Amino acid sequence: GLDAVRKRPGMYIGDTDDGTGLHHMVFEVVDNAIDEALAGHCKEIIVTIHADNSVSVQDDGRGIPTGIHPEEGVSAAEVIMTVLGVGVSVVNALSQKLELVIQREGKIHRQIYEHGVPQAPLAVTGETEKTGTMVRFWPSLETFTNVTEFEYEILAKRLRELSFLNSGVSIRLRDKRDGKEDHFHYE
Ligand SMILES: CCNC(=O)Nc1cc(Nc2cccc(C)c2)c(C(=O)Nc2cccc(C)c2)cn1
Secondary structure (H helix, E strand, O other): OHHHHHHOHHHHHOOOOOOHHHHHHHHHHHHHHHHHHHOOOOOEEEEEEOOOOOEEEEEOOOOOOOOEOOOOOOEHHHHHHHOOOOOHHHHHHOEEEEEEEEEEOOEEEEEEEEOOEEOOOOEEEEEOOOOEEEEEEEEOOOOOOOOOOOOHHHHHHHHHHHHHHOOOOEEEEEEOOOOOEEEEOOO
């Protein structure tokens, strides 16, 4: 299933050789945070381009659900991240690594995937007074060629649009490679 997305990545994410699909990957993750803001529950989304060839998206909403199905022993989070506006499970499938961190009901929950395959079960990693969801992913270099790094202006342009299409939401873009920071919010 995740094998199908890796065999024909272009079908799912867009062109893999000119940057298009690489940036679509971020937008897929952002769209999920935007939907939490449209549901009334998220006021700030933070997109950070890291210096290790990863992007993180962090929202301040309710947190992705963390419950376990008792008979299956798989968390809701894992179901969201592994099963097939193409969905975040596609992003996971085309990421050499993906880290999900969820702050919810006083606890921090974390899980790591490699090419979509979870490495261990969802685990509690501490306590928190805050709620929200953070996804950080390192795109697969077996999939993406030529443009394998994130480009601030492609994200900036798009995140500005989202902020004005979803008035009230605050969207912050941060680049760790040079300290560039933008804040998009409209009234
Ligand atoms: C960085 C990317 N941001 C997010 O993924 N934000 C996010 C997503 C959420 N749910 C969600 C995600 C993907 C697929 C589906 C169906 C739901 C939810 C969500 O549905 N939380 C929620 C909402 C109602 C009840 C419970 C238990 C949990 C909250 N935030």
